[PDB]
Every structure is written in C-alpha cells, then in structure tokens.
Design a protein around this ligand. Structure first.
Ligand SMILES: CCCCCCCCNC(=O)N1CCC(C)CC1
Ligand SMILES: CCCCCCCCNC(=O)N1CCC(C)CC1
Lengths: 193, 193
C-alpha cells in the first residue's frame, strides 16, 4: 500500500524529468508502478494529485531541514548563517528540479498547489523576519525596513531566482553562481545602512 | 484600420480587468469593438495575438520611459537615481495590472510571449549592469559580485515582487510599501561591502 504509492510517486518524478505532466497519462504512471489503471485510482484520484503529493514531500523536506538548522545553529559568522539557510532551499529544490518545475506550473491551475506553496512561503517569510528581528535586538543589524516586508522581498527573490537557475531560463544566474549571488544580496540588505 | 485595432485592444484590456483570457471569447472582443467576428479575424489571428500585442505595448512603454530617463538623468543622490528607475516599472506595469497578470499567465503557453518577456528582461538586466559598472568605474560602488549576475537577481526580484504586489498574492509586500522595499535592497546590495 505504502509500496505501490511510493512506486507511483517515483514513476511520476522520473517521467517529469523528460516531459510535462500534460504529456504523462495515468496509464504511464500505472505501467511504471507495475499496477493497472484502476488500481492507480485506488491510491490517487488523478495525476494532478500525484504531483501535489510530490510537491508536498519536497516542500516538507525543505521545511524540516530548516527546522533542523533552526534547532542546530552552525558556529560561523552572519554571512555563513544566512548561506547555510539559503542552501537548504538550493539543495532541496535543486535535487528535485523536475518536481520544482512541474509544481510551479501547477500553481496556475491547482488551488491546492497554490495554497500549499502560499502556506510554506508564509512560514519561511515569518521565520526569516524572526531571525532579522533577533539580529536587530542583539544590535547586529540596523533597524531599517519593516523586517516582514524585507523578508518577503528576499524570499520572493530566492523563489524566482532559484527557479530561473534550475529551469535554465533566459535570463538566469548560472546555477554555480546563484548561491553566492543571493547570499550577497541578503547580507547587504539585512546588515546595511 | 488603426481605429478598429485600437478598439479591439481597448476592449480586451477592459475585459481582462474582470476575467481571464480563457473566459473571453473573440465574440466578446468583436462585440466591444463594434465589429463582427470575421472582421476581428482580419485584424488579429486569435485572442492570444491580442494579448501579445497588449503586452508588447506595455513592455515597450516601460522600455521607452527607461530610455527617456537614461537620456535625461535626474539631479539627485544614488538612492533617488535607482528609485526613479524602479518607478518606471512600478508605474508602467502598475497602470496595466490586468495585462500584466494575463501576460505572466501567457508565458507558460505562448512561445511569442515568453520570447518577448525574455528579450526585454535581457535588455533591462544589461542596462542595470552597465549602470552598476559605471558606478564602480567612478569609485561610487565597490567591486563585489559580477555586475551582470547581481543585475540579474535584482531584476528577477523586481519582476516577482512587483507582480505579487499587483496581483494581491499571499505572500506579497503591500503595494504602498513595495517601491521603498525594492529600493533599499538595490541600494544596499549595489553599494554595500
Ligand atoms: C525553486 C524554488 C525555491 C523556493 C525558495 C523559497 C524560499 C526562499 N527562502 C530562503 O531561501 N530562506 C528563508 C529562510 C531563511 C532563514 C533562509 C533563506
Ligand atoms: C510586474 C512586472 C514587473 C517587471 C519588472 C522587470 C524589470 C525590473 N527592473 C527594474 O526595476 N529596473 C531595471 C533598470 C534599472 C535602471 C531600474 C530598475
């Protein structure tokens, strides 16, 4: 039950590497998972539900890694503190580029995908603002913009910029340059007057 | 000829304020422009072509305003120089929110929309990098990140963040706060070490 489900999810992630969800039939999913079409429909209502589950897994993997870091601070300067946090997103979404691409496309057509993405962006922005607020309270960062507004723009930059790098968009920052680029902008905008 | 074309474009921009392009028939466009369906097809091949033309107009309005500013520098500090430039995009796209929303949706399904947006983002990034390079050459900005990579991330931040504000997304920076938020991040990241 868990095993046919994981086989369907694994098949979908593999097929998304080579074509969009629109070009994957539920027949393709059932065939890769070694089940029939009706048996598929027992585990998922639709191929869209399979993508929602894949995206939910990736988003929660990033969130749990951020929670781990939040509990287990690295012993490092402020630049490295922010770099390690942005790296959670770089590594987690960068390790699942096909699901990342497909999920972003699904935001336009799926209220459940849009709501999942909104929920976690709100969480990550709130955490970012709490860290900025802590840095200001300790005297390490200046009281410039409203922390939640700064956090929002920085998180949206990372969403757009990581996505463009992963998707090979024109324009994009090269993938081998994107982490340093984002870290610079975060550190200067958080600590700068 | 120019006048029936402008009537079709005006009808489309008005109807996009209240519903997506998928919910606008070519009958609706012809009716608002005071022409028949076949007469529509004389001026545009499709409703998608009408949106491409609307987006082309808005993008070139922003580009021409940036060209005007590039030729007619304001007599102001570095913060105001960048604020005036970001404001071109805030005002131009903010004055055409329905076309902005519809154009962004069309990038997923229209190679011509995607290519139009890419072409102008490349232009605006190249201009941004040239200004950063000039600021470094004059000794006003430090030689930190590769200017074209910094420019790319900043332009992508503005694309995503302005869009979220205009579209009322959750999350977003309030529209009345977005210009100050972006200016801060640009100035600190360009001038900061
Ligand atoms: C391609 C999809 C990528 C989506 C990335 C969206 C989140 C970006 N947010 C961050 O990078 N964070 C927030 C938390 C702080 C502590 C570290 C930095
Ligand atoms: C909702 C669609 C918005 C899209 C905005 C895309 C462009 C953002 N770029 C800028 O803001 N610029 C670039 C040029 C310099 C000199 C000023 C700042």
């Amino acid at each position: 039950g868990d095993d046919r489900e994981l086989a369907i999810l694994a098949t979908a992630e593999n097929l998304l590497e080579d074509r969009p969800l629109a070009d994957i039939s539920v027949d393709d999913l059932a065939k890769g998972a070694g089940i029939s079409r009706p048996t598929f429909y027992f585990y998922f209502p639709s191929k869209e539900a399979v993508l929602l589950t894949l995206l939910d897994r990736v988003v929660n993997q990033a969130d749990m890694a951020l929670q781990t870091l939040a509990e287990n601070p690295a012993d490092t300067d402020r630049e490295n503190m922010w770099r390690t946090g942005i790296n959670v997103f770089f590594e987690t979404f960068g390790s699942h580029k096909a699901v990342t691409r497909a999920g972003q496309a699904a935001r336009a057509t799926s209220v459940e995908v849009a709501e999942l993405w909104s929920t976690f962006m709100q969480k990550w922005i709130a955490y970012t603002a709490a860290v900025i607020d802590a840095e200001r309270d300790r005297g390490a960062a200046p009281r410039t913009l409203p922390a939640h507004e700064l956090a929002t723009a920085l998180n949206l930059m990372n969403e757009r910029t990581l996505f463009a790098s992963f998707a090979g968009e024109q324009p994009s920052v090269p993938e081998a340059r994107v982490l340093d680029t984002l870290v610079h902008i975060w550190v200067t905008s958080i600590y700068g007057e």
